[PDB]
Amino acid sequence: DSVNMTAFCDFYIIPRSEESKCTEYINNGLPPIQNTRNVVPLSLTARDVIHYRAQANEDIVISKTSLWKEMQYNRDITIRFKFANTIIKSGGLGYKWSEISFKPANYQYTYTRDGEEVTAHTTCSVNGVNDFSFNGGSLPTDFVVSKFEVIKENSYVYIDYWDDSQAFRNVVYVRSLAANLNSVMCTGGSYNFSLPVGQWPVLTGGAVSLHSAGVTLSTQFTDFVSLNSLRFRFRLAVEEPHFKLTRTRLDRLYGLPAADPNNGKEYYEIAGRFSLISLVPSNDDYQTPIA
Amino acid sequence: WGPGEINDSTTVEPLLDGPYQPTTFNPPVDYWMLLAPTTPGVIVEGTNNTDRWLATILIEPNVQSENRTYTIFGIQEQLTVSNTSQDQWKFIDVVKTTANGSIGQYGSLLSSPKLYAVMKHNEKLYTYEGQTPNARTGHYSTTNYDSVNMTAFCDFYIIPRSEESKCTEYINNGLPPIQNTRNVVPLSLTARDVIHYRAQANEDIVISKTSLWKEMQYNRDITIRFKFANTIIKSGGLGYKWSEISFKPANYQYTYTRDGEEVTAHTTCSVNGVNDFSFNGGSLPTDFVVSKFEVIKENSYVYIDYWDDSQAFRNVVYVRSLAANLNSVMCTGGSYNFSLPVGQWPVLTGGAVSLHSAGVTLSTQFTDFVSLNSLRFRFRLAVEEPHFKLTRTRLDRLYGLPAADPNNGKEYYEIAGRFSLISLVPSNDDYQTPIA
Amino acid sequence: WGPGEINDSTTVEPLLDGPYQPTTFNPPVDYWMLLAPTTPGVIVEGTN
């Protein structure tokens, strides 16, 4: 078991979980499959718009007139964040990790406001990505990372809500949804990379800032039931502290890494307010019958 | 506003380094090859195979005139040395012109941090040099400039001549990791919570009175044509490792007509579900290296931005529903060739995915002043593809759209359909007739 | 209510996990060393 072998050229290695494919390799040898299709396509062959002769364009009106109100809605806002992350191991010898993932935020909160129990949803996504990696070398004992997202201040973070409280759930066709928000500490922890020999690297640091930014509106649609969206256009920032990295040759990594902002932190609280001016038809106290 | 979408952008260029795998090599022209071992002794041999066979040794200081054995070109014999220097490490340059000839040791480089560069450049050869934090350059009129070859046992660094500065400071001291250009905070009030602590009687206030809101629908046609935009970013070094081959958005124009009236439009491509992938032909510098090919699988939707300067977009802003039946057509790809100074040029050719409309997407960007607009259609993509062509690759004939060339050589892709409408805008007066 | 999120990952699906130069194996025990030769001869030399 204390063997020490030396291969003098370009050769391949494989761990346990792929013994079977190694057996078919030494049985037939299958580098090539070169066809990512299952079978004769179990789908429609081709259905385009034949005969695009659209005839004379004629218009029919569905319904009669309507009565819509215009109210400004200034509501204080306490929406609470927690950056979701999932861990998926990557194959190799043990220092060969590639998969760091991002999942949308899934949390629910409870607050009181004028007696209403606050129900709201929070889901987060990040773009303007600032990915990174570690080239510890190429020898199978080297540090290997394929993607290591270090979110820098040039990134835009998308936060989406399905806010259940009716205060949020009475506003569609908003003429102008303005708001004010707060800042978050959004720190970061560290992980380790484990090939069964030697001390393991520590991606240390992480103390980043967030500040105010925009918010937008969008909607999707299916056949007869649509899809509404409360999309946020927020950008991450940077602050004074530097984030050291020890026992590594790639150090002073600046910004949030992709690994872990939980660190035992309860949540990421960003309070603020809303101010929505909405076209609304449901506040007509007018067409009431007699008696 | 113009088109609105930001899908993905992985810009990674803070690195000024990147080694190879320690082996033998045949360096091309116009670079420097920065070695970096951790122990004194032989590192690499200069080989030309016709006229000159160079050699060099790095030596630990403080060891005055002595005698050390060395395995020059795999053949060992006894050699004399000298370290009158006692602080920084010496790096002699054993200049030899024939393997059977005398062992001519030269060179007086004085540097502890154990890094030096020798590589072909400008149809000529030279060397760096240095004593203390005063690094200069050696001058080597080596006959047979043209056939430089390196045979080593430790790691290198690939680095051109054009930026002599950074390398001369590396050989001066070395490479501390990335360190700087992150402190910009012109945004802070104080303490983050003194100024808002309230809830204070939330949303309730009137802005405007109500009016009549009828519907005036406009059921006419719509047509769209497609093309994609790509950026190719490779990695540094000799020019074989590559990084980025994918799509990017871009604003495109058309002069349409509809209902007997001309129409002008804006369009910008945006695609969901694009799969990065490394078609790695081998990490070694004489093989095929691309960090990622962003490829398409049927998990790809369409967020291609679309615009129309017709009456339609001016009309429909408050849309509760808008459906159609667009021309579900086939989309293919083009052909592109990769540049490899030695070997055979790898290629990308083929690839096709068919679309089917799966919804619409309106979007409005509210600024602090105004309300930017945007609109998109959703197409779900099914593959019927000519099996990607890319030679000298272990992986071939993959499915989806090619990551390099969408031009397709043909005219365009036909996308067309009709529309209903729903809206509420000021209309004529029905108050004038309040009775049947 | 319907969300929107974009993220993707696809790395080594053929598990092509042996591109390496001439080696110095002191590896973790218990693997399978695929041989990828150009011309047969001496391929690997082992030592206790």
- Please name the residue that has the structure tokens 């890494």: A257
Which is it for strands A232-237 and A156-160: parallel, antiparallel or unpaired?
antiparallel
- C6/B272 touch (CB, cutoff 8 Å), yes or no: yes
State the residue for tokens 């060397």.
B127
Question: Contact at 8 Å (CB) between B135 and B172?
Answer: yes
CA A55 to CA B197: how far, in whole Å? 62
- Listed residue (B296, B359, B355) closest to B327, CA to CA: B355
Q: Which of B385, B339, B380, B345 is closest to B359 using CA atoms?
A: B380
- Per the structure block, which two tokens stand in for B214? 């009828």
| H or E, element range at B59 | strand B53-59
- Cα separations (Å) of B397 from B277, B279, B430? 14, 12, 66
Containing A21, the helix (H) or strand (E) segment is: helix A19-27
Residue C34 touches chain B, beta carbons under 8 Å: no
Q: What's chain B's length in residues?
A: 436
Decide: B112 and B133 in contact? Cβ < 8 Å: no
Q: What is the dihedral of CA A41, A43, A46, A52, to 10 degrees?
A: -170
Q: Does residue C36 belong to the interface with chain B, where contact is any CB pair within 8 Å?
A: no
d(CA A41, CA A51): 26
Method by which the coordinates were obtained: cryo-EM
* Cα–Cα distance list, C41 to A79, B44, B355, C38 (Å): 68, 25, 53, 9
C5 touches chain A (CB under 8 A): yes
| Nearest residue in A to C11, CA atom | A98
Tokens coding A54: 């659209």
Q: CA A65, CA A45: separation in Å to the nearest integer?
A: 45
* Residues forming beta bridges with residue B363, ordered by sequence position: A218, B374
CB A124 within 8 A of CB A81: yes
The dihedrals phi and psi of A21, each to the nearest 5 degrees, come to: -70, -30
Amino acid, single-letter form, for residue B311: Q
Closest to A153 in 3D by CA, of A213, A203, A99: A213
Let me know: does A151 contact A126? Beta carbons within 8 Å: yes
Contact A139 C25 (CB under 8 A): no
Contact A45, A262 (CB under 8 A): no
Backbone angles phi, psi at B146, to 5 degrees: -80, -15
Q: What is the DSSP letter of B146?
A: G
CA dihedral sign, ordered B160, B166, B169, B173: negative
What lies within 8 Å, CB to CB, of B80 at 6+ separation is B65, B66, B67, B68
Question: Which of A207, A181, C6, A263 has its CA nearest to residue B193?
Answer: A181
Tokens read off for B407: 């031009």
Q: How far is CA B100 from CA B73, B142, B143, in A?
A: 10, 18, 18
Interchain CB contact of C40 with A (< 8 Å): no
The size of the A-B interface in CB pairs under 8 A is: 237
Is the Cα torsion angle B403, B405, B409, B411 positive or negative in sign? Answer: positive
Asked if B206's CB is within 8 angstroms of A71's CB, the reply is yes
What is the distance between the alpha carbons of residues C16 and A31, in angstroms, rounded to a whole number? 8
Strand ordering across the sheet containing B134-139:
B24-25, B149-152, B41-47, B53-59, B90-94, B105-110, B126-131, B134-139
Contact A279, A175 (CB under 8 A): yes
CA torsion, ordered B13, B15, B16, B19, to nearest 10 deg: -120
Residues in chain A closer than 8 A to C44 (CB atoms) = 5-8, 11
How far apart, in whole angstroms, are the C-alpha atoms of residue B148 and residue B128?
16
**How far apart are alpha carbons A10 and B250 in whole angstroms?**
43
Q: Which of residues 184-223 of B touch A (CB under 8 A)?
A: 184-185, 187-188, 192-193, 196, 198-200, 202-221
Residue B268 near residue B251, CB atoms below 8 Å: yes
Run of H or E residues at B54: strand B53-59
- Residues on chain C touching A123 (C-beta within 8 angstroms): 3, 5
B277, B289, B295: best to mutate for the C interface, most C CBs within 10 A: B277
Q: Is B147 helix (H, G, I), strand (E, B) or coil?
A: helix
DSSP E strands in B350-434: the ranges are: 352-366, 371-383, 414-418
- How far, in Å, CA of B126 to CA of B145, rounded? 10
Look up residue A272 and give its DSSP letter.
Answer: E
Whether residues A214 and B365 touch (CB distance < 8 A) is answered with yes
Are A68 and B425 a contacting pair, CB within 8 Å? Answer: no
Residue type, A204: T
Instruction: Say how far apart CA A145 and CA A195 lie, in whole Å.
Output: 13
Chains with 3 or more CB pairs under 8 A to chain A: B, C
Pair of tokens at residue B253: 């124009």
3-state helix, strand and coil shares in percent for chain B, rounded to the nearest 5: 5, 40, 60
Q: How many whole angstroms separate alpha carbon B411 and alpha carbon B226?
A: 10
Chain C contacts of B273, Cβ < 8 Å? Answer: 8
Resolution (A): 4.4
Total Cβ atoms within 10 A of residue B69 = 8
Q: Measured between beta carbons, which residues in chain B are less than 8 angstroms from residue C13?
A: 277
Closest CA to B5 of B407, B373, B400: B373
Ranges of beta strands (E only) in B276-408 are: 289-293, 295-296, 305-308, 330-332, 335-337, 347-349, 352-366, 371-383
